[PDB]
């Protein structure tokens, strides 16, 4: 919702202040192409991983407080499939065979699995408050042999998703080997993982402590990290509670979960803002480099010879610029990769240093960002 003001603030600041300095010095031919509007409007995604009949699909319904197309509660394993729940003007759905082609979607690379997975993948779209801020990806309930590498497709989402929610149900915690194998594939991104102990009101209080204890026992035994994961304990659906002895607990745990999900878009706005700052700093360095190569060329003759001196001397050039501009050697591009790319360029064609374009980036980093953060402080 209001995050659209932040998205528009980055786009505006980039196109006005940063993109001119990138274009003037062929930034897009050395390091990274120009940012499209798709690089600013990305919403955070959540991946739901869990075994069959744990409550993933109902969990989504609970958050949306509304049904979504093709939800199918309690389906057959063969029919159970991946679903990308995303915002839409009208309640519709899109099969995975066409969703893979959509250039305005981050699912274009999924085409590499093809056929058997695409017949098990779709995008259900609906106008919903929750979906204006995040997207949710329901995975098939872990159980006999599918038609696609089920682990790699889970591992594929896990890398591009902002939050991974492992779901278990207290009424029948049966952590399997297929599930363990999946969680091991998620290692290296533990900072994205959160757990949900579902159906916690179906058992008595003691059994809840037995199951919850077993869950954490065999989790640390798998993930093998000192940083203990957060588990949200509760019954996540609209129905009344069965065992009410832990009512206060389940409600507090649901709020901690709501606050975590509701924080994701603000967390992404911060990440995008830092990326724009780092790109801006890299465009300055690139500009200082190209400008120094142009400045040192001769007025007429010895061009091809001088071009090779400068490339051979490029490491010394870095230090030369790190000293007379008080810039860190960290946000300098790799030395050798530059040398390799500078061969294909006529250094005389480069532009000279444009102070106007650098001041446009500097006054952005000092004045314009402090306000943009404030827009993120008021979530």
Annotation: binding site for ATP? 50-57, 199, 237
Report the C-alpha gap between 230 and 141 in whole angstroms.
Answer: 22
Buried b (16+ CB within 10 A) or exposed e, 93-122: ebebeebbeeeeebbeebeebeeebbebbb
User: CB of 128: closest distance to ligand AGS in angstroms?
Assistant: 18
Q: Is residue 48 classed as helix, strand or coil in its secondary structure? A: strand
Asked if 57 is part of the footprint of ligand AGS (rule: CB under 6 A), the reply reads yes
Q: Name the minimum Å distance from CB 239 to ligand AGS.
A: 7
Pair of tokens at residue 144: 């006999």
Q: Which residue has the tokens 């499939």?
A: 81
Counting contacts by CB under 5 A, is residue 57 touching Mg ion? yes
Residues 141, 233, 276, 285: which binds ligand AGS (CB under 6 A)?
A: 141
Q: How would you classify the pairing of strands 82-87 and 135-138?
A: antiparallel
What is the rounded CA–CA span in Å between residue 346 and residue 240? 73
Q: Sign of the CA dihedral 353, 357, 361, 367?
A: positive
Smallest distance from the beta carbon of 122 to its own copies, in angstroms? 36
- Binding-site residues: 50-57, 199, 237
Interface pick for ligand AGS out of 58, 125, 133, 135 (rule CB under 6 A):
58
Distance, in Å, from the CA atom of 145 to the CA atom of 149, rounded to the nearest integer, reads 10
What is the smallest separation between the CB atom of 254 and Mg ion, expressed in angstroms?
18
Number of residues that bind ligand AGS (CB under 6 A): 21
* Of 133 and 235, CB closest to ligand AGS: 235
Binding site for its own copies (CB under 8 A): 205-206, 209, 212-214, 216-221, 224, 226, 228-229, 231, 233, 245-246, 248-249, 252-253, 256
Helices 247-295 and 3-13 sit at what angle, rounded to 10 degrees?
Answer: 10
User: Would you say the C-alpha torsion 255, 172, 190, 58 has a positive or negative sign?
Assistant: negative
Q: Is 7 in the site for Mg ion (CB under 5 A)?
A: no
- State the Cα–Cα distance between residues 103 and 90, nearest whole angstrom: 20
Beta bridge partners of 196: 167, 232
For residue 163, which of 270, 45, 3 has the smallest C-alpha distance?
A: 45
Question: Is residue 124 a contact point for ligand AGS (CB under 6 A)?
Answer: no
Q: What is the closest distance, in whole angstroms, from the C-beta atom of residue 124 to Mg ion in the complex?
A: 11
287 Rama class: left (phi>0) / alpha (psi -120 to 50) / beta = alpha
Q: x/- contact string, 179-198, with ligand AGS (CB under 6 A)? A: -------------------x
Choose from ligand AGS, Mg ion, its own copies, none: what does 233 bind? Cβ within 5-8 Å by kind: its own copies
Contacting residue, 80, 138, 201, 253, with Mg ion by CB under 5 A:
138
From the list its own copies, Mg ion, ligand AGS, none, partner contacted by residue 231 (C-beta under 5 to 8 A by kind): its own copies
Interface with Mg ion includes 56 (CB under 5 A)?
Answer: yes
If the CB atoms of residues 112 and 247 are measured against its own copies, the closer one turns out to be 247
Q: Closest distance between ligand AGS and the C-beta of residue 83, in Å?
A: 7
- Backbone phi, psi, residue 166, to 5°: -80, 130
Distance of CA 190 to the CA centre of its chain: 14
Residue (19 or 223) nearer to its own copies, CB? 223
Among 8, 33, 74, 188, binds ligand AGS (CB under 6 A): 74
Angle at 139 between CA 134 and CA 145, to 5 degrees: 165
Nearer to its own copies, 205 or 263 (CB): 205
Point out which residues bind Mg ion (CB under 5 A): 56-57, 138
Point out which residues bind ligand AGS (CB under 6 A): 50, 52-58, 72-75, 80, 138, 141, 198-199, 202, 235-237
């Amino acid at each position: 919702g209001g995050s659209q003001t932040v998205t528009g603030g980055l786009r505006s600041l980039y196109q006005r202040k940063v993109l001119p300095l990138e274009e003037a010095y062929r930034f897009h031919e050395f390091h990274s192409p120009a940012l499209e509007d798709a690089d600013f409007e990305n919403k955070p995604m959540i991946l739901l991983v869990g075994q069959y009949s744990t409550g993933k699909t109902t969990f989504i319904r609970y958050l949306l407080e509304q049904d979504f197309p093709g939800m199918r509660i309690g389906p057959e394993p063969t029919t159970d499939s991946f679903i990308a729940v995303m915002y839409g003007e009208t309640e519709g759905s899109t099969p995975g065979n066409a969703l893979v082609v959509d250039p305005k979607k981050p699912f274009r690379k999924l085409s590499r699995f093809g056929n058997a997975f695409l017949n098990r993948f779709m995008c259900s779209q609906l106008p919903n408050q929750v979906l204006k801020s995040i997207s949710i990806i329901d995975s098939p309930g872990i159980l006999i042999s599918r038609g696609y590498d089920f682990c790699q497709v889970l591992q594929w989402f896990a890398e591009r998703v902002d939050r991974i929610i492992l779901l278990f149900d207290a009424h029948k915690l049966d952590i399997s080997d297929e599930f363990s194998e999946a969680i091991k594939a998620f290692r290296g991104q533990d900072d994205k993982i959160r757990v949900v102990l579902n159906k916690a009101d179906q058992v008595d209080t003691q059994q809840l402590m037995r199951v919850y204890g077993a869950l954490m026992w065999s989790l640390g035994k798998v993930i093998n990290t000192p940083e203990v994961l957060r588990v949200y304990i509760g019954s996540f659906w609209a129905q009344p509670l069965q065992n009410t002895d832990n009512r206060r607990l389940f409600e507090a745990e649901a709020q901690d979960l709501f606050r975590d999900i509701q924080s994701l878009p603000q967390k992404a706005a911060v990440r995008k803002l830092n990326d724009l700052i780092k790109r801006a700093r890299l465009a300055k360095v690139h500009a200082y480099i190209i400008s120094y190569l142009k400045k040192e060329m001769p007025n007429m003759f010895g061009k091809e010879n001088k071009k090779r001196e400068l490339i051979y001397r490029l490491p010394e050039i870095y230090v030369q610029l790190q000293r007379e501009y008080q810039i860190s050697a960290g946000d300098f591009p790799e030395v050798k990769a530059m040398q390799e790319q500078l061969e294909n360029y006529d250094f005389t064609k480069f532009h000279s240093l444009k102070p106007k374009l650098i001041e446009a980036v500097d006054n952005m980093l000092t004045n314009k960002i402090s306000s943009l953060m404030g827009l993120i402080s008021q979530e």
